[PDB]
Amino acid sequence: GETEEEKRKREFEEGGGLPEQPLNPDFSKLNPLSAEIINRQATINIGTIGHVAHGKSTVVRAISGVQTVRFKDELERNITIKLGYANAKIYKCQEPTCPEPDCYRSFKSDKEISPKCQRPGCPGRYKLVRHVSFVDCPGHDILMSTMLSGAAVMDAALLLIAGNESCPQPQTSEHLAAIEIMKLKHVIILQNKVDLMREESALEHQKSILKFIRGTIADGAPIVPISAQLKYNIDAVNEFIVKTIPVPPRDFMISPRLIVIRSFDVNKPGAEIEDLKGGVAGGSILNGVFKLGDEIEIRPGIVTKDDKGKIQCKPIFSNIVSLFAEQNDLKFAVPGGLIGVGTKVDPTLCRADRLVGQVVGAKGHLPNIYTDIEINYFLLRRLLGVKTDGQKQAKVRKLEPNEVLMVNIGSTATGARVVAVKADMARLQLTSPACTEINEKIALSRRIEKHWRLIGWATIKKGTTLEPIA
Amino acid sequence: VGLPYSELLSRFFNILRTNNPEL
RNA sequence: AGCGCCGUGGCGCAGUGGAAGCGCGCAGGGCUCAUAACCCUGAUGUCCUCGGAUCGAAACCGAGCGGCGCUACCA
Ligand SMILES: Nc1nc2c(ncn2[C@@H]2O[C@H](COP(=O)(O)OP(=O)(O)CP(=O)(O)O)[C@@H](O)[C@H]2O)c(=O)[nH]1
Ligand SMILES: [Mg+2]
């Protein structure tokens, strides 16, 4: 006669709960899968790529259980501009007797260390191998900077293909090539529709998907039949994530940095402002451990235009108040994931798509803002995303001086003008400020068929610096 | 190697046949 | 989540501080040899819940039901 909530409570108590992180742990010995780290933070960022109207948030929800908002009335149904997120934990059964394929089970972040095994007949307990964060990416042809920024964030890929539709989906190929651009090679192919399609169509679609990916950079990509609503073949997904995808080399030997993609103003309506919260910027830490209590500044920050037309860049110093990750406020931040940094940054600064694609650095470093950048660029032979009805997919043209091109340096979305075009090198003038940290793998897109279309890749080799104003 | 892909497909079809014999 | 807006007689509007409203609908009747036009009378209301002051409240206000416009997804 025990209520379900008290049952979940005794499960949480028996599972060990969620222990608080130590205030100052020895950071030399902390590996990304330590109990102090992995029980309360995701360490690998997995992103879903696919064509529109195929279902990516639903798949992650079936994996994890955390919903991806889907806000803004009009965007409740069609497409979402900003990235959708969900927390997932990979729990593996410790009992060897139960079959390996169903040992894996993906749970919400609200779960404990050692939850009971839900298979009928198994008293054993699960072990949390790793927490994984899910950076969902828009899969539409208009929103192109967002998916490139998400790819700059994410570390593992899940490609989504429909079964009953046409095999050579161009949006998926564009996404796959975009991931190929930035030194990311772990992609898992996931067939969304398996219930509504036949047995021989299954082999036909398998063969088509195999034939598509033969000459691209990724060669050994696994394929898995999944279903977003039937809630099946989820354990094998976690198995593939565990086995195929390792942790890229990332430690604390590197200087701290941040890359903010989403802005969040914490201003609860109706309640008195005497009890208010700060401004939260959603940023990935690709390098450097962060802790409660720091001085940090965004480099481009305030972008003002004077009476003479010159652009003045005021970096925005801010004292971080908290580092929200997973479910609980943490004391140390584990790099290699999106954490919500809540700081004293003015709430209006975090309201709209203002902190979208912007680099941030802790005090003790000086990232450099650039206004004219020298890039080295390489192109593909054909455009990706165009549906020519049976004729020679649009061939890529060579660049022209004084044209606007969307030059996505990591997460930044910049419309640059071209100054000089060489065979491999070019110079870009940016009215929207951009910053340089080390190399910053860049993506390039242009405009022919209205909406932006990817063309190739670029890497910064030089630039013209603008000193931040104190 | 897509050999470990047809197996999950077989499992999915078998689950469908057991759960939904009408289809 | 909050800020402004609202509450049919079937419908859109109007007064709402003294008790059931207009016009369009529907029914019936009149005019015409006959129809439409025109002219009369109707039969339809818990004018969204709980309450208040008041000889009075759909109406004036408040502890809420429902739906819009707006800020807008507010970790
Ligand atoms: N029959 C079937 N329908 C599915 C499946 N997966 C998703 N859908 C349907 O796709 C529709 C779109 O869902 P949604 O996840 O919001 O699309 P989206 O991926 O966010 C749009 P974009 O790809 O551009 O980001 C849903 O109605 C869902 O029922 C599936 O496996 N089978
Ligand atoms: Mg989305």
| C-beta of residue A111 within 8 angstroms of C-beta of residue A127 | no
Q: Which residues have C-beta within 8 Å of that of residue A396, sequence separation ≥ 6? A: A379, A380, A381, A382, A383, A455, A456
Contact state of A202 with B9 under an 8 Å Cβ cutoff: yes
| C-beta of residue A89 within 8 angstroms of C-beta of residue A132 | yes
Output the CA torsion A278→A282→A286→A292 (10° steps): 20
Q: Over chain A, what HEC string results?
A: CCCHHHHHHHHHHHCCCCCCCCCCCCCCCCCCCCHHHHCCCCCEEEEEEECCCCCCHHHHHHHCCCCCCCCCHHHHCCCCCCCCEEEEEEEEECCCCCCCCCCEEEECCCCCCCCECCCCCCCCEEEEEEEEEEECCCCCCCCCHHHHHHHHHCCEEEEEECCCCCCCCHHHHHHHHHHHHCCCCCEEEEECCCCCCCHHHHHHHHHHHHHHCCCCCCCCCCEEECECCCCECCHHHHHHHHHHCCCCCCCCCCCCCEEEEEEEECCCCCCCCCCCCCEEEEEECCCCCEECCCEEEEEEEEEEECCCCCEEEEEEEEEEEEEECCCCECCEECCCCEEEEEECCCHHHHCCCCCCCEEEEEECECCEEEEEEEEEEEECCECCCCCCCCCCCCECCCCCCCCEEEEEECCCCCEEEEEEECCCEEEEEEEEEEEECCCCCEEEEEECCCCEEEEEEEEEEEEEEECCCC
Of B1, B4, B12, the CB nearest to A194: B12
Nucleotides of C under 7 A from a protein CB: 1-3, 71-75
Spell out which residues of chain A touch residue B14, defining contact as CB-CB under 8 Å.
Answer: none
In this structure, which ligand is nearest to the CA of A195?
1
Contact state of A223 with B16 under an 8 Å Cβ cutoff: no
Judge if the beta carbon of residue A396 lies within 6 A of ligand 1: no
Residue A267 structure tokens: 């201003």
Q: Which residues of A121-157 are buried (b: 16+ CB within 10 A; e: fewer)?
A: ebebbbebbbbbbbbbbbbbbebbbbbbbbbbbbbbb
Ligand 1 centroid to A68 CA: how many Å?
Answer: 13
CATH 2.40.30.10 occupies which residues in chain A? 251-366, 367-462
Q: Which residues of B touch A (CB under 8 A)?
A: 1-2, 4-6, 8-9, 11-13, 15-16, 23
In this structure, which ligand is nearest to the CA of A79?
1
A156 is annotated as contributing to ligand binding: no
Tell how strand A358-362 and strand A295-305 pair up: antiparallel
CATH 3.40.50.300 occupies which residues in chain A? 41-250
Residue A418 structure tokens: 């071209």
Judge if the beta carbon of residue A139 lies within 6 A of ligand 1: yes
Is the shortest CB-to-strand distance from A123 to strand C under 7 Å? no
Shortest Cα–Cα distance, B20 to chain A (Å):
10
CATH of A41-250, one of 1.10.8.50, 3.50.50.60, 3.30.70.120, 3.40.50.300: 3.40.50.300
Whose C-alpha lies nearest to ligand 1, atom 28?
A55
Q: How far apart are the first and last CA of chain B?
A: 31
Is the shortest CB-to-strand distance from A326 to strand C under 7 Å? no
Q: C-alpha angle with apex A242: B16 to A182, nearest 5 degrees?
A: 105
Is the shortest CB-to-strand distance from A264 to strand C under 7 Å? yes
Query: Residue A191: exposed, middle, or buried by beta-carbon count in 10 A (0-12, 13-18, 19+)?
Result: buried
Q: Which CATH class is domain A251-366?
A: mainly beta
Spatial CA neighbour of A338 closest among A139, A140, A167, A86: A86
Å resolution of this model? 3.8
Q: How far apart are CA A321 and CA A328, in angstroms?
A: 14
Is the shortest CB-to-strand distance from A73 to strand C under 7 Å? yes
Q: What technique was this entry resolved by?
A: cryo-EM
Query: What is the CATH number that goes with domain A367-462?
Result: 2.40.30.10
Whose C-alpha lies nearest to ligand 1, atom 16?
A55
Spell out which residues of chain A touch residue B4, defining contact as CB-CB under 8 Å.
Answer: 222
Whose C-alpha lies nearest to ligand 1, atom 10?
A55
